[PDB]
Amino acid sequence: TKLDEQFEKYPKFEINKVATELNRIIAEYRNNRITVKFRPGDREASEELAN
Amino acid sequence: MATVLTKGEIVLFALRKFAIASNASLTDVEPQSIEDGVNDLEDMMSEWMINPGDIGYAFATGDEQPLPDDESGLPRKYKHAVGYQLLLRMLSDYSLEPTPQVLSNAQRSYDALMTDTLVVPSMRRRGDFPVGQGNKYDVFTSDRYYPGDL
């Protein structure tokens, strides 16, 4: 507001409290990362193929 | 302004409002009561530069003397307030006391004058008070913490 011919602005404090659970979730994945597997089948040579 | 208030018109108003010199009570008017009234008005206006504050009165430049024909410089919206205050101050010259209705009128006019010169100074922030991260003191503005001075 003007406040006697000035432009003082409202104080806007920021206390970030929504990031803790997000960090917990991200740490959960970075601990156990998981990737592709390529399971074999029922055949004479599928084991070596999967390897 | 509309018709321009002179210093003599204000004292004539005060003299008329208590039936001392007017054409609609009995008769008559005196020349010394005019100089006394104008000097009283000048001293009142000098004093009013403190409590009610300046309202635009035009003082005499250099010594000379006020004179009733000089232009007062006041807006016409103030003449009742000024006249009633002057009448209250100069009643005791003639050994008279005001009636309650006159006091009520004087108070109402004074209140109207007071309403038109308010300020309400609207105190500011201090100077050691932080300004939050929410308004980006680094890039958009500068100087985290309010100036609180100027």
Q: What is B32-49 written as a DSSP string?
A: HHHHHHHHHHHHHHHHTT
Helices (H), B73-130: 79-90, 100-115
* Method in brief: cryo-EM
The alpha-helical segments, DSSP class H, found in chain A are 20-31, 46-50
Residue B127 in marked binding region:
no
Spatial contact of B144 and B131, defined as CB atoms under 8 Å apart: yes
Distances (CA, A) of A46 to A35, A36, A37, A49: 20, 17, 14, 5
Domain limits at B65?
1-150
The breaks in chain A (C to N more than 2.5 Å) occur after none
Q: How far apart are CA B147 and CA A7, in angstroms?
A: 11
Resolution in A: 2.8
Structural domain total, chain B: 1
B53 alpha carbon, distance to own chain's centre: 7
C-beta atoms of A9 and B135 within 8 A: yes
- Measured between CB atoms, which of B121, B134, B146 is closest to A13? B134
Quick one: residue B45, left, alpha or beta (phi over 0 = left, psi -120 to 50 = alpha)? alpha
How far from B92 is each of B13, B37, B52, B89, CA to CA, in Å? 17, 12, 23, 7
